[PDB]
From Swiss-Prot:
Protein known as: Endolysin
Family, per entry: Belongs to the glycosyl hydrolase 24 family.
E.C. designation(s): 3.2.1.17
Effect on the protein upon substituting residue 30 to A: Almost complete loss of enzymatic activity
Induction: Expressed late in the viral replication.
Effect ascribed to mutating residue 11 to Q: Complete loss of activity
Result for mutant: residue 20 to C: Nearly no effet on specific enzymatic activity
UniProt entry keywords in alphabetical sequence: Antimicrobial, Bacteriolytic enzyme, Cytolysis, Glycosidase, Host cell lysis by virus, Host cytoplasm, Hydrolase, Viral release from host cell
Activity-pH dependence: Optimum pH is 7.3.
């Protein structure tokens, strides 16, 4: 168990443009292409991300390249972010992986907004953070994934994913 396996589990792998659980164009391993409703805007974005004339289809190698880029950006956004970095710094390894999950999934901005849980995590009030985390749109939209990520933070083990 690592952050790569963890996310690959949570997001799936899809080699052809598809629609996210909220309506958005996505591809590979959880990579958001566009929030616009144009499939055309979406092959163009994809086209652009990959560096060749896609077609709306990528190889597995291509998908992993994007993934590697996205995990990177996530880690680097956390470390850069003044609100996020101290939370991350205070956590153990398992729990850091889950924090990364939460940011990949939702944006550095996104979660820099998850104010109270951030402060609960930092204060190592696991149970309470878990309850607060579940009180979100995120949770209510994708409850099975969210539960897995929340248990990982609540427990510090990889149980939800064996
Ligand atoms: Cl990109
Ligand atoms: Cl899910």
């Amino acid at each position: 168990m690592n952050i790569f396996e963890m996310l690959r589990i949570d997001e799936g792998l899809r080699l052809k443009i598809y629609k996210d659980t909220e309506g958005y164009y996505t591809i590979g391993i959880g990579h958001l292409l566009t929030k616009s409703p144009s499939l055309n805007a979406a092959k163009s974005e994809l086209d652009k991300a990959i560096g060749r004339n896609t077609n709306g289809v990528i190889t597995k190698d291509e998908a992993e390249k994007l993934f590697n880029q996205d995990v990177d950006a996530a880690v680097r956004g956390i470390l850069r972010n003044a609100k996020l970095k101290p939370v991350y710094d205070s956590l153990d390894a398992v729990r850091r992986a889950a924090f990364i999950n939460l940011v990949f999934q939702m944006g550095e901005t996104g979660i820099a907004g998850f104010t109270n849980s951030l402060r609960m995590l930092q204060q190592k009030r696991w149970d309470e953070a878990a309850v607060n985390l579940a009180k979100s749109r995120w949770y209510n939209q994708t409850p099975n994934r969210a539960k897995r990520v929340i248990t990982t933070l609540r427990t510090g083990t990889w149980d939800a994913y064996k």
